[model samples]
Target: DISESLRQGGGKLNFDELRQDLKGKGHTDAEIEAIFTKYDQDGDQELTEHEHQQMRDDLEKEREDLDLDHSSL
Candidate 1:
């Protein structure tokens, strides 16, 4: 969702916007910061295209894994 939102913003975003958006969606501040920091990669607080794509890929994989786990139960 973040990737989609950022794509709407022309494919780049800073940490502040990231935090604000996630917070509005009911995510905790700490969780938002942790994820932003993880894919931020560089210390510039901006997530460029590659980092955003990597984050999206990882998130999609995680969701798929969760779905598979739930289905196997």
Candidate 2:
């Protein structure tokens, strides 16, 4: 959902829209920037499609998970 939105409007995500929303949720500017760069994977001002996709793919690639309960005794 996040990356899908980023894919719109020329494959870029802006600071104001995303940052402001996060700030509205009580995040500080520095904390927001830190989270931003972590998602972007680089210290760039703007977010790119690749960064968006990277997160999408990473989310789809969780390290460890299985439906053990379904196979339980």
Candidate 3:
């Protein structure tokens, strides 16, 4: 639910946008920062393509878990 809410409106979310979304979902800044830190393997401020892809995969998995059927779309 959090991930879907964050990805709503059909737009991609960058690192900053993701952070904002997480914050809006009641995640503390420290929690968001920790998640970013863990995923940013290269220490770059931005998430690499690999990281983004992994995020997409994870989101899709969550969608399935939620039984969200987007087939008609």
Candidate 4:
């Protein structure tokens, strides 16, 4: 669903793409930047697959905390 949302919203994403997606979802640039900085791990401007997976895991945990479910998927 996230992949679909991203696709329907517009084009493909790189690391900076996350910022655009977040902004479209109403996050401020500062908030998006803070998240990127926090998760960038290797201090690279782009997130590696490992870092991206970590972000996904973190977000899934947060969604569970908020009682959201994607189990139907």
Candidate 5:
């Protein structure tokens, strides 16, 4: 439900809103900016539809990796 945590307006994600949400969970501003740039694609401040989709796919893969790590223990 990552999307639910983000603020969307006209299908674009606002970086400030995203930052606020993550910060509320104790994530530092630097950490949030790093992750945001990873999927920003065109070096734009905001994430477009395609870029957001890419981020979601990567998140899903990361989740699977974590699950596998736990299972291997």
Candidate 6:
């Protein structure tokens, strides 16, 4: 829920936008920062479609693992 609300464009987003979204959804600064860190993957700390695909693959792989504890939704 936090991550889904934080993302604006389809898996494409910046921290500022995420911050606004997270805060708008009632997340605190520390919560926002922590969630942002979790979503960020590539260089420059942008959460892109690339990271999303990576997550998808990771989840499918980990069905054997039941992983991704703090997920987007």
Runs with alpha carbons beyond 4 Å of true place in candidate 5: 1-11, 19-23, 39-73
Cα-based lDDT for every prediction: 0.53, 0.53, 0.50, 0.50, 0.53, 0.53
Lowest summed lDDT across 10 adjacent residues in model 6 is found at 1-10
lDDT of 5: 0.53
List TM-scores for all candidates, in order: 0.29, 0.30, 0.28, 0.27, 0.31, 0.30
Residue 73 in candidate 4 has what lDDT? Answer: 53
Over the full model, what C-alpha lDDT does candidate 6 score relative to the true structure? 0.53
Report the alpha-carbon TM-score of model 5 versus the true structure. Answer: 0.31
> Compared with the true structure, what per-residue lDDT tens digits does model 3 show for residues 1-73?
2234434223444455554444364367566556666765433334545566665465655554455645343
Per-residue CA lDDT of model 1 for 1-73, tens digit only, reads 3233444255566666544334364377566567656655554455767777766565655554333222322
Best by TM-score: 5
lDDT of 4 at 3: 37
lDDT score at residue 7, model 1, on the 0-100 scale: 42
- What digit string (tens of lDDT, one per residue) describes model 2 on residues 15-44? 654543333653666776667666754555
CA deviation > 4 Å runs, candidate 4: 5-15, 19-23, 39-72
What's the lDDT for residue 71 in model 2? 42
Q: Model 3: what TM-score?
A: 0.28
Position 46, candidate 1: lDDT = 56
Q: Model 3 off-target regions past 4 Å?
A: 1-9, 19-23, 39-69
Clashes of each: 0, 0, 0, 0, 0, 1
Which stretches of candidate 6 lie above 4 Å from their native place?
Answer: 1-3, 6-13, 24-45, 54-57, 64-73
66 Cα displacement, candidate 6 (Å): 11
Tell me model 3's lDDT, rounded to 2 decimals: 0.50
